[PDB]
């Protein structure tokens, strides 16, 4: 199961997102 952390009353209108790794490890995405 998956339990909430955060709500935000921003007003933004997002269309596309991008991750950000770090340097001195795969990752999965999926849609709803």
């Amino acid at each position: 199961a998956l339990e909430p952390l955060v709500d935000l009353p921003i007003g933004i209108n997002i269309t596309r997102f991008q991750t950000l790794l770090a340097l001195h490890a795969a990752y999965y995405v999926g849609y709803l």
Binding site: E3, P4, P9, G11
Partner: protein, 49 residues
């Protein structure tokens, strides 16, 4: 002041009152409105719940 279809942010404090138990009372709880007798419980609730 300005109003928008986006969520509002500025409201008055919406002050509270004291607590009344075991007596048939009206009640408002953050928005949930009803009437009844409200008593001390022993259930187990999650923090978000």
């Amino acid at each position: 002041f300005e109003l928008l279809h986006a969520p509002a942010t500025v409201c008055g404090p919406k002050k509270s009152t004291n607590l009344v138990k075991n007596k048939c009372v009206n009640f408002n709880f953050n928005g949930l409105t009803g009437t009844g007798v409200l008593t001390e419980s022993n259930k187990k609730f999650l923090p978000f719940q």
